[PDB]
Amino acid sequence: GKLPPGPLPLPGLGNLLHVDTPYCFDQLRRRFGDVFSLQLAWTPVVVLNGLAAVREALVTHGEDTADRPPVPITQILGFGPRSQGVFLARYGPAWREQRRFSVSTLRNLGLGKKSLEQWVTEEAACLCAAFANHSGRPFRPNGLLDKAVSNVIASLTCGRRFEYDDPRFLRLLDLAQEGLKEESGFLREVLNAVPVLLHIPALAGKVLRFQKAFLTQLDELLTEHRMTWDPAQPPRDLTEAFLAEMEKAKGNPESSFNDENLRIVVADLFSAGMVTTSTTLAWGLLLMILHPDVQRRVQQEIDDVIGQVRRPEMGDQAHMPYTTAVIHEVQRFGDIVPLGVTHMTSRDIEVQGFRIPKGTTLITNLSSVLKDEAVWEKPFRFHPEHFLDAQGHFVKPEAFLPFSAGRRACLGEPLARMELFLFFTSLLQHFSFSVPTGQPRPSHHGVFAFLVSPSPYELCAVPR
Ligand code: HEM
Ligand SMILES: Cn1cc([C@H]2C[C@H]3CSC(N)=N[C@@]3(c3ccc(F)cc3F)CO2)cn1
Ligand SMILES: [Zn+2]
Ligand SMILES: [Zn+2]
Ligand SMILES: [Zn+2]
Ligand SMILES: [Zn+2]
């Protein structure tokens, strides 16, 4: 069939100089259509735009697009056939076993005695107190959001939290944010292309220094956890559940439940739901000071449904359509993973008539879905009524895809939904946020990366 169109491919760089990225893709979408091609050096890339193209790839051809592009340099971090974690894992048994394990263990810890909801609610309390200490004084809330969000994951993985001034905790969070920067590095591409370049010890020790440091700090914490683990009792957290599975899997070279995969799985879970959920909440609080009237309606609904003392529960959401709409609109407008996470075709597939060869790198332009002018009333405005009808009922459009879609859709979404609702309501239940008098109106345009964060800003949190 016909291959997707695209700008003229230069000899060596191809379309590398035709892309400086979501803004640039919008122009290409308006010039070549919703499915265009790109030649990024050695890698053949097809960009998918709009709900239909994205759905057709990830749902209709879900079996064939659930794979990841190979990342050879992950060998430095100890990746192997039965140890690929979940996030970057190739489509196959190693991915599926860990995927099913994480999803089911989240659910098991989730239901019963609401361990998840309890850990979040309790961490929300700490976040409130830490906010109270920063009162009467403008302050960036990002650091506190990272910590509270990080503690929720630590609670699920290792069954503990860390104090906000814990030295090892800070180093962990610091190493994690530096590591994220290392993923968007130019040297990553060269070494992924030619794996034998890693046989140079000079280079190998430079590639993922912050990644390796992060995994080292994590190893130390895992070792402590293995000491306190009581195998005579039902697993209290995901790491214990993993360790129990490891015992049963002794003698089985096919199991992905092993030492090498434990640190990778934990690192995937710990980080993927630390910079995403926290950035979303950082967007949330920014949008609340830019739109004080929206903030007041939320706080009003909080009082009408929950009050100003009793801690919020997930059962309250069903009776809080407006707050729910606001949170959704934060994710939509926030648009924090505009190009999602790359997929790869494991077979020859067909998208929007065009042909996609096997082994093609797929980019899901999630931004083009969340900001679709054909779907949303005013997609470039912060507008909670994107999820409300005239009667005030919450409505969720098909195009709400911040967690992507299909087999590889965010496994942490249920937890994320929980963290977002409980942290947001709890903060707005006890605080009123506003721009600091004397300071310029903070921009609503984010700083582009693999993850789009709000521009740096300060705020005032006055108690209620
Ligand atoms: C606002 C919060 C979050 C957003 C917007 C978000 C978004 C995403 C996106 C776009 C993907 C890519 C899906 C794809 O490859 O097509 C993804 C995958 C993933 N997310 Fe999240 N995420 C969030 C929070 C979390 C949390 C809390 C966790 C874990 C506790 C988590 C863990 C993961 C993992 C492990 C994957 C890989 C799944 C797989 O490859 O099978 N994320 N997420
Ligand atoms: C959805 N989404 C998750 C992300 C996260 C996922 C994590 C874990 S797995 C990975 N490959 N990179 C991340 C990551 C990797 C190493 C590290 F030291 C810190 C990290 F945050 C960055 O992107 C960004 N968007
Ligand atoms: Zn831990
Ligand atoms: Zn434990
Ligand atoms: Zn209605
Ligand atoms: Zn209060």
Side-chain angles (χ1 to χ4, degrees):
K2 297 282 294 299
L3 298 184
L8 52 98
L10 285 187
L13 279 70
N15 301 96
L16 188 141
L17 297 186
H18 296 285
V19 170
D20 66 321
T21 311
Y23 275 102
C24 180
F25 282 180
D26 296 326
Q27 302 170 330
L28 300 180
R29 186 190 61 251
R30 288 191 293 266
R31 194 187 305 180
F32 299 94
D34 286 329
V35 184
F36 61 90
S37 290
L38 286 181
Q39 186 64 33
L40 306 183
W42 298 86
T43 304
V45 171
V46 171
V47 180
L48 305 161
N49 303 266
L51 181 56
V54 168
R55 277 192 71 88
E56 186 174 342
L58 302 179
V59 182
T60 303
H61 292 285
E63 289 180 348
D64 311 320
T65 58
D67 197 16
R68 298 283 188 219
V71 187
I73 65 175
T74 58
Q75 293 160 337
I76 306 179
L77 308 182
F79 278 62
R82 297 299 181 171
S83 50
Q84 321 181 36
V86 179
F87 198 87
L88 288 176
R90 299 300 302 275
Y91 188 66
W95 165 84
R96 194 175 347 260
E97 181 168 44
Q98 282 316 309
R99 169 95 183 184
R100 180 213 37 82
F101 168 79
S102 302
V103 167
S104 47
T105 287
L106 279 181
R107 188 183 63 249
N108 287 12
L109 298 165
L111 56 87
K113 307 180 64 176
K114 305 184 306 176
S115 289
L116 271 64
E117 185 167 350
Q118 187 174 342
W119 274 313
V120 177
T121 310
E122 288 177 5
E123 192 61 31
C126 298
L127 188 54
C128 282
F131 262 62
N133 275 262
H134 295 71
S135 282
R137 207 167 75 118
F139 72 99
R140 301 184 183 184
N142 303 41
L144 297 186
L145 294 176
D146 296 339
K147 295 174 180 179
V149 166
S150 303
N151 268 341
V152 175
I153 313 292
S155 310
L156 295 194
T157 46
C158 282
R160 76 161 295 185
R161 68 176 300 272
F162 302 88
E163 296 293 348
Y164 290 164
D165 59 335
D166 185 306
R168 286 190 308 178
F169 190 45
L170 304 182
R171 186 175 184 268
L172 194 64
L173 302 193
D174 199 275
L175 291 180
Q177 292 172 3
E178 295 281 60
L180 186 136
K181 297 184 57 183
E182 283 183 329
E183 264 205 341
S184 293
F186 183 84
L187 192 50
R188 166 171 267 235
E189 297 298 325
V190 185
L191 302 167
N192 272 328
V194 188
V196 308
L197 288 177
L198 300 180
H199 288 60
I200 305 181
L203 260 185
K206 179 187 177 182
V207 198
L208 305 179
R209 42 173 178 170
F210 292 106
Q211 310 261 126
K212 288 211 63 181
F214 179 72
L215 291 166
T216 305
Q217 180 65 83
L218 206 71
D219 285 323
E220 176 184 332
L221 296 175
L222 288 169
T223 300
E224 293 179 355
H225 190 195
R226 194 189 290 259
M227 173 66 63
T228 59
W229 172 39
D230 183 9
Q233 300 298 327
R236 215 182 56 90
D237 48 59
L238 183 132
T239 292
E240 288 178 18
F242 198 104
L243 291 163
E245 291 306 318
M246 217 172 324
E247 283 296 315
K248 297 160 57 185
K250 281 168 70 180
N252 185 11
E254 301 186 25
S255 189
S256 64
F257 290 101
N258 48 77
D259 285 320
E260 292 84 354
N261 208 26
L262 172 60
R263 54 203 295 279
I264 296 179
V265 163
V266 168
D268 282 2
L269 289 176
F270 193 88
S271 44
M274 162 167 55
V275 63
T276 47
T277 311
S278 180
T279 301
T280 296
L281 292 161
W283 270 109
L285 293 189
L286 167 65
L287 290 161
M288 283 311 100
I289 67 184
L290 287 181
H291 301 261
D293 55 320
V294 173
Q295 182 183 164
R296 297 179 199 115
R297 282 195 61 174
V298 174
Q299 287 164 330
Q300 188 59 43
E301 194 187 45
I302 283 172
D303 299 336
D304 287 27
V305 172
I306 299 182
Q308 205 175 138
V309 42
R310 168 182 150 268
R311 294 180 174 180
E313 308 168 11
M314 290 304 306
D316 295 320
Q317 182 187 42
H319 304 100
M320 301 175 70
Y322 188 82
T323 293
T324 310
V326 167
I327 290 172
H328 281 68
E329 177 69 356
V330 165
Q331 298 200 264
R332 193 208 63 80
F333 181 86
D335 192 12
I336 73 181
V337 210
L339 303 175
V341 178
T342 63
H343 292 235
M344 192 180 66
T345 53
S346 56
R347 285 182 179 179
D348 284 32
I349 74 170
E350 180 177 302
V351 175
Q352 303 271 286
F354 301 104
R355 188 183 84 101
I356 315 291
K358 177 186 173 180
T360 310
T361 288
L362 258 45
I363 303 190
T364 77
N365 193 338
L366 300 181
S367 195
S368 69
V369 187
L370 298 183
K371 305 278 180 59
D372 195 324
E373 285 168 303
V375 169
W376 309 95
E377 185 181 357
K378 43 182 76 174
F380 306 119
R381 302 283 186 79
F382 181 71
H383 187 56
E385 287 72 27
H386 278 140
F387 299 85
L388 293 167
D389 62 13
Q391 193 74 2
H393 302 150
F394 171 81
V395 298
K396 183 169 64 180
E398 309 269 284
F400 184 75
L401 282 191
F403 299 104
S404 185
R407 284 176 168 82
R408 287 282 194 149
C410 187
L411 69 78
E413 175 175 359
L415 176 62
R417 289 258 58 94
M418 182 174 304
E419 286 180 301
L420 289 182
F421 181 74
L422 295 178
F423 283 139
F424 192 69
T425 50
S426 297
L427 285 180
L428 280 196
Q429 187 192 33
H430 287 264
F431 292 103
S432 178
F433 301 98
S434 46
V435 292
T437 59
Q439 301 192 18
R441 166 159 283 243
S443 174
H444 53 275
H445 308 269
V447 196
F448 171 65
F450 180 65
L451 196 147
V452 172
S453 283
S455 191
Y457 68 95
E458 301 179 350
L459 49 66
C460 286
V462 287
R464 306 208 310 153

